[PDB]
Amino acid sequence: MLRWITAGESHGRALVAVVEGMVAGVHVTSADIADQLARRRLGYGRERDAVTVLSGIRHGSTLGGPIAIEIGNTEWPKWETVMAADPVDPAELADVARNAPLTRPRPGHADYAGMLKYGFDDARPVLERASARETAARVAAGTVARAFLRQALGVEVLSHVISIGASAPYEGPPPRAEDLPAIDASPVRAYDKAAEADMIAQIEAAKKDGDTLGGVVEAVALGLPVGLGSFTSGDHRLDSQLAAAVMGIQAIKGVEIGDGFQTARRRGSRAHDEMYPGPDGVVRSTNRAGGLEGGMTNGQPLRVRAAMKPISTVPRALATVDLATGDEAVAIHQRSDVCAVPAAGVVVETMVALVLARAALEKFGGDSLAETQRNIAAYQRSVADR
Amino acid sequence: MLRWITAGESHGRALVAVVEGMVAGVHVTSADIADQLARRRLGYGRERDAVTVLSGIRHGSTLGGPIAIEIGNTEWPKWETVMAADPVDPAELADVARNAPLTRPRPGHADYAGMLKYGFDDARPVLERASARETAARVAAGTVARAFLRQALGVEVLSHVISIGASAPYEGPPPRAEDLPAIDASPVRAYDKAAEADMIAQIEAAKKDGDTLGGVVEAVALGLPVGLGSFTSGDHRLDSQLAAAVMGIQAIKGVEIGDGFQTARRRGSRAHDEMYPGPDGVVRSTNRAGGLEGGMTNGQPLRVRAAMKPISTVPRALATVDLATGDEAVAIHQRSDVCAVPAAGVVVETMVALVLARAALEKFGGDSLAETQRNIAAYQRSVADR
Ligand SMILES: Cc1cc2nc3c(=O)[nH]c(=O)nc-3n(C[C@H](O)[C@H](O)[C@H](O)COP(=O)(O)O)c2cc1C
Ligand SMILES: Cc1cc2nc3c(=O)[nH]c(=O)nc-3n(C[C@H](O)[C@H](O)[C@H](O)COP(=O)(O)O)c2cc1C
Ligand code: NA
Ligand code: NA
Ligand code: NA
Ligand code: NA
């Protein structure tokens, strides 16, 4: 089974992604990874040599074994003592201001619950791993998944921003793959010019007020065959798996498949996607279901929406308690941006790609790309022969 | 690790739930299971001896091994040939009208994608397993989880209905455990009398029009300790795990933790739950996060909302294709109700309970309830001693 794991602290030496269970023969390079990492940095309101492929790829082709990708920390020299792996003289450490105690947990962040859970008197060990810097390692892994999906299935994954702050949501038609350059060129990764202007204005107002914004993003996967995922149990359903992968992204508080919560307000006669005869099989005129029925891909674009909360580190830090003393306090000062919704969209693409690649390998099997491709072709033919 | 699996076809001999990895010493009986199964049948707009505990429980106490619970099918005699496990003479079968071909997949259901996936020319094998009858087996498993949560942690799980059809959503405060009798006595399992009347009216109108409705439900878990789930990776986050467990319920198209999509429309200064000193530790005046931060329980009520689509089997069957011929068709006639939202709420409680019980055993360990309880107490004391 395809599996992915990330490791690293935000201010540690490096991040590492490991992908296991990918077939041999998938073309992917350090440049591909760097390109996707650059996309994760996109957005209004927020070193390529830092990527090193350590294992599992040779001459731009996957080997079949575990793929380990390292992302170096360019500011490691500042953190090499505070985040040293090995012991440091506590006296030396005591003189380092940067090592000062972090005992005022931020509302909305992992700090408080993680400190209690792990018995830590300091937030440092929690925030270092909880930080969304970890999504960089996710994107490295996702690049391997996305290469596989393209090469094996002709599938493309993209995202666009639906709303930021109080903007009027974009409810027009979703983009296609050919639209991604324009989307990534938008300061807010919008597919609609009116929505773009509205969102930029919301960010400007928040920026002036010293506040932060969340938003809603939609990931779209195009070209999927029918029958990835299964109805046979809750955990094998693709909607279940996608919901896990997307809700587990930092700051995501909501996930929808297709029209989601709006579907719940509709009558059955107007809520589903009717089927009609077509040249090359069944066709539909709507995609309210977002490309999934009974936990399976149904031929239509997959559409997954995610709601991101506004960043919790607000420049003037919110009210909290100093756990050292029990006193009222203002929260620890940390990384804050006005809005990270466009980047959150890119992270959603990655998690969607990983889950789709896993599901594809489950159905089509194979140990090399050519093998998997033969199996895909035979299945497609069998469906066509219906 | 706590694991659950369901087995059975809707019209097969019986359903089976198996729960593995539950500690010994949890008090649970066949009557408890039957009671929860009865709750799953609640709701306007839709045999206890049928429950048999086969293994893993002795004299009302779990043994520590796998717990297998059987739910018999009272109409098995009608289906004993059509759904026979063993071969039947095809000539005999050919004379049975009930065995007629089902080749007109229902929009919105598993039929089409499942038929293509598995290479079936008939929807019968798909709909039999995809059917929400399977949620009965889930509820049997969930009963074991819910007993554990109560006995080990003093935790209660309940649900109420927020909206059905075009009703004005209930946005008042959530219920407590003591409110469940009143909720379960409501025809639509509402906690608010105005919302109740509104929802009942929506159902009446849909029923008259021969249409179906979906809705939104909220599950609440009370009494949870801080620090279940973890921030250490996406898959260990409780929000991820809950999203998987809830989205994998038949007809769920959206999941929120706390204020969800509405949170995405708020400014950071008004989106999070500030912390204040209190007698027995940190207290909060809001629970916008729904009891989770950084993938961990944070002391506040857990709140999970789920959007259920209107049932897809509409009495006058929607437009589809007959896969046998390629012709336009009306969809296969099957079980339809006007609204199953109240029952969907009960199913959400079960999936929440299962995930919470698993997370609790991950942190607190133990092989018997008394052992787990000692470990819980020691952790609580260590937190108090802060
Ligand atoms: C791309 C990305 C960037 C983020 N940047 C920040 C940030 O700069 N400051 C912050 O407080 N939270 C940021 N977050 C969110 C926190 O990491 C997150 O809220 C925290 O780990 C608690 O997890 P939860 O919000 O999922 O409960 C970011 C999230 C993502 C997806
Ligand atoms: C309690 C419960 C009862 C349901 N009853 C029906 C029903 O009677 N008829 C129907 O078409 N769908 C019913 N459903 C929904 C279908 O099982 C579901 O839409 C189908 O398996 C396709 O899965 P998906 O909607 O998750 O894509 C019910 C769901 C639940 C939770
Ligand atoms: Na679409
Ligand atoms: Na190959
Ligand atoms: Na609450
Ligand atoms: Na015991």
From Swiss-Prot, chains A, B:
Highest rank taxon of the organism: Bacteria
Biological process according to GO: amino acid biosynthetic process; aromatic amino acid family biosynthetic process; chorismate biosynthetic process
Gene3D superfamilies: Chorismate synthase AroC
Keyword tRNA processing: no
Pathway recorded for this protein: Metabolic intermediate biosynthesis; chorismate biosynthesis; chorismate from D-erythrose 4-phosphate and phosphoenolpyruvate: step 7/7
Binding, FMN: 129-131, 250-251, 294, 309-313, 335
Cofactor, free-text remark: Reduced FMN (FMNH(2)).
Keywords tagged on the record: Amino-acid biosynthesis, Aromatic amino acid biosynthesis, FAD, Flavoprotein, FMN, Lyase, NADP
Coiled coil: none
MF terms in GO: chorismate synthase activity; FMN binding; NAD binding; oxidoreductase activity, acting on NAD(P)H
Cofactor(s) the protein needs: FMNH2
Gene Ontology CC entries for this record: cytosol
EC annotation from Swiss-Prot or TrEMBL: 4.2.3.5
UniProt keyword Secreted, yes or no: no
Binding residues for NADP(+): 40, 46
Reactions accelerated catalytically: 5-O-(1-carboxyvinyl)-3-phosphoshikimate = chorismate + phosphate
InterPro entries found in the cross-reference section: Chorismate_synth, Chorismate_synth_AroC_sf, Chorismate_synthase_CS
Function: This reaction introduces a second double bond into the aromatic ring system.
Family, similarity comment: Belongs to the chorismate synthase family.
UniProt-listed NCBIfam families: aroC (TIGR00033), PRK05382.1 (NF003793)
More details: Was identified as a high-confidence drug target.
Assembly, per entry: Homotetramer: dimer of dimers.
Entry protein name: Chorismate synthase
